[PDB]
Design a protein around this ligand. Sequence first.
Ligand SMILES: Nc1nc2c(ncn2[C@@H]2O[C@H](COP(=O)(O)OP(=O)(O)O)[C@@H](O)[C@H]2O)c(=O)[nH]1
Ligand SMILES: [Mg+2]
Length: 448
Amino acid sequence: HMDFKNINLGIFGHIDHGKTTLSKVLTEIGFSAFKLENYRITLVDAPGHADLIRAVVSAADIIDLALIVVDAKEGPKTQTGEHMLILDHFNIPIIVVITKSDNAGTEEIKRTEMIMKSILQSTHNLKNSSIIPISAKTGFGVDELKNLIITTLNNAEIIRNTESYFKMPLDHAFPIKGAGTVVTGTINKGIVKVGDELKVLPINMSTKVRSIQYFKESVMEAKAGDRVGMAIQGVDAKQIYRGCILTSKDTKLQTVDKIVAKIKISDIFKYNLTPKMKVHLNVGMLIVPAVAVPFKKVTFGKTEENIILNEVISGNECYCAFELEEKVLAEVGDRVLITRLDLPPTTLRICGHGLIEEFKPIKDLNIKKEVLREGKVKIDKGRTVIDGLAQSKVAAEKLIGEEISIEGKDIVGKIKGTFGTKGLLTAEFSGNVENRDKVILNRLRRWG
Ligand SMILES: Nc1nc2c(ncn2[C@@H]2O[C@H](COP(=O)(O)OP(=O)(O)O)[C@@H](O)[C@H]2O)c(=O)[nH]1
Ligand SMILES: [Mg+2]
């Protein structure tokens, strides 16, 4: 017959907004799927709030399209917001579906519609995404929703990665007996054939593939993007839990403690740069408490330094050094999601996102502090003094023999002397120094 294309469709939104009902309506035309044209569409499914999060963080590669449901009457709520954010960070095309249109008047629907438009405009990659009102109970606009899903899937670039090592997470695990186990999950990268030797991580065992179940059918081979059941031998299902990963033996996957990421910030005004910060880091399918130290990479003309962030977010660099409390499975280039989930569900919980550049500890990053002390130039008759670099004779004495520049005048000087008990100094300059001049003291420090 005709060649099918395998699609994974996520469904997101606040609870009671009609996620489940929409899913059921879609599935009638574990594993729950439906067909549109030649698209085989498997629903990415988790019960709710944090589960969808854990689902996207891990499965982002293979999630082609997402439906974000919003009640017509009460409009966007918090969870709608965080789902929107997450989907924006991971660059997943979305359709905004306004549910329960039968329970709302035209005016209300148009209102919510416009609110959603305004919201969509505040996002990077979701900037304009089509919005349809529907009623899953009534069937209102559902046909149009299907046609739209088709159009969107037609436009979006769907890249399945076969070429790399086989990489799949494990959602569920069923023992049969001591000699066998069945796991279920969607393949991220690579290819599997029946009778292959793979491994479970972090526990690092070695198992063989007995059976591949795809689309309620047995197949010899599965590919990335396919959501499959798999029977494997050499493991009991008690050892396999929420964070386990089945992968080939050529794998680049590592069990990691320290993670260095390149971080993009979601909302600038809600974001804060105070270093050594306690957050919840989403990596793969887990969420591990973590400590973060924001820093930027500066080229001084000879050596590249990693300097603690100057609190300026101008320029997009926010390399974060993360130290994790627990372990995690990661690869270089994996999308990582910084959340604060300690906060109540009532407020937006996303503290960032970013690509893992290196697995490295802070101590080896040679972290440094940019050090600037500013003081003025007071000149009485015949004598030049610098004020404000030191608050006492002790500190003033500590400063002797440093490098100092004068602002905007392009003039260099060294500070030799220490004047008075109040911390005044004396310095050697190139000539043409004037009263009330600006002195910048510049040096590199050991941070923390
Ligand atoms: N009138 C109407 N009610 C709906 C529609 N979709 C869902 N509901 C109702 O909303 C309630 C909860 O929706 P649900 O499917 O559980 O959404 P979820 O909890 O976010 O997955 C149920 O009692 C449904 O009857 C709709 O299109 N029209
Ligand atoms: Mg539900």
